[PDB]
Amino acid sequence: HWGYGKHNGPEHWHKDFPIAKGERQSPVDIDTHTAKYDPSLKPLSVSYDQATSLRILNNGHAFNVEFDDSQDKAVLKGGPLDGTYRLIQFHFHWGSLDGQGSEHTVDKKKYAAELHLVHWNTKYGDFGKAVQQPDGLAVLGIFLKVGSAKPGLQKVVDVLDSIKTKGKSADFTNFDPRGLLPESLDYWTYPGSLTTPPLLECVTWIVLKEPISVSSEQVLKFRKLNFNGEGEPEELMVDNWRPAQPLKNRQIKASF
Ligand SMILES: N[C@@H](Cc1c[nH]c2ccccc12)C(=O)O
Ligand SMILES: [Zn+2]
Numbered sequence: 001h002w003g004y005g006k007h008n009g010p011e012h013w014h015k016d017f018p019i020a021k022g023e024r025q026s027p028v029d030i031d032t033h034t035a036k037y038d039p040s041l042k043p044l045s046v047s048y049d050q051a052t053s054l055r056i057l058n059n060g061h062a063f064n065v066e067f068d069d070s071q072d073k074a075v076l077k078g079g080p081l082d083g084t085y086r087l088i089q090f091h092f093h094w095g096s097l098d099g100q101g102s103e104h105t106v107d108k109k110k111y112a113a114e115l116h117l118v119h120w121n122t123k124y125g126d127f128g129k130a131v132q133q134p135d136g137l138a139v140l141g142i143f144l145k146v147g148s149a150k151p152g153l154q155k156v157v158d159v160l161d162s163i164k165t166k167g168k169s170a171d172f173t174n175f176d177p178r179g180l181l182p183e184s185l186d187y188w189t190y191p192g193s194l195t196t197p198p199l200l201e202c203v204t205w206i207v208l209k210e211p212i213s214v215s216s217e218q219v220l221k222f223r224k225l226n227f228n229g230e231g232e233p234e235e236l237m238v239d240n241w242r243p244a245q246p247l248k249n250r251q252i253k254a255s256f
Pocket of ligand 2: 093
């Protein structure tokens with residue numbers, strides 16, 4: 001099926017998912033000199049104090065940290081958003097080398113990785129209905145650069161050896177996603193899509209300006225994960241990022 005290689009990677013996705021060539025695809029390059037400050041944006045509210053993580057899953061393309069989204073516990077509101085969006089999962093995209101890995105770019109600059117906190121609009125009742133709506137999802141994107149370790153990431157790094165291969169999961173309760181956030185919530189926002197098949201055009205993207213730093217040893221552990229299943233030959237899970245797609249006359253707004 002779809003993947004990140006020569007034969008099944010982003011250049012091929014349009015065949016099973018024609019929307020890959022659509023009008024609001026993600027990621028995009030953020031041209032900081034074209035983005036305009038928007039005084040009408042309300043402040044962003046990231047409310048993760050009551051977040052309830054359940055499980056971490058290697059899905060053969062990345063790893064998902066899943067949350068209990070059956071009540072308002074971990075929510076995003078404000079900024080460009082109307083109403084309340086509940087956190088369902090987070091995951092990362094990363095490179096084989098520190099010079100690449102993010103999906104969004106900033107004036108063409110690629111970061112070592114990018115974190116996506118995925119949230120659905122509680123007016124649509126659940127995730128599956130939300131992804132049929134142009135305002136169904138809100139993704140909080142955070143860049144990772146290699147430098148100092150991120151302490152709040154280490155519980156994730158240390159569980160990775162237990163989910164090396166496709167289909168493996170592990171209990172992952174009491175993980176606090178507040179430990180993954182940079183200091184500043186300054187952000188760019190634009191309308192876009194999920195960045196993996198089925199590439200649904202349902203996302204208000206909120207991309208924070210300030211990257212988090214993670215250590216070389218932390219990202220190296222991401223690169224030890226496998227795309228393949230247990231029992232299959234080793235295919236390191238690296239370079240699971242889609243490159244920048246055409247902006248097509250969308251406007252990126254700045255909160256700052
Ligand atoms: N089952 C998916 C998400 C999903 C697919 N269809 C849905 C319908 C309703 C709610 C959620 C879903 C998951 O969490 O892996
Ligand atoms: Zn993603």
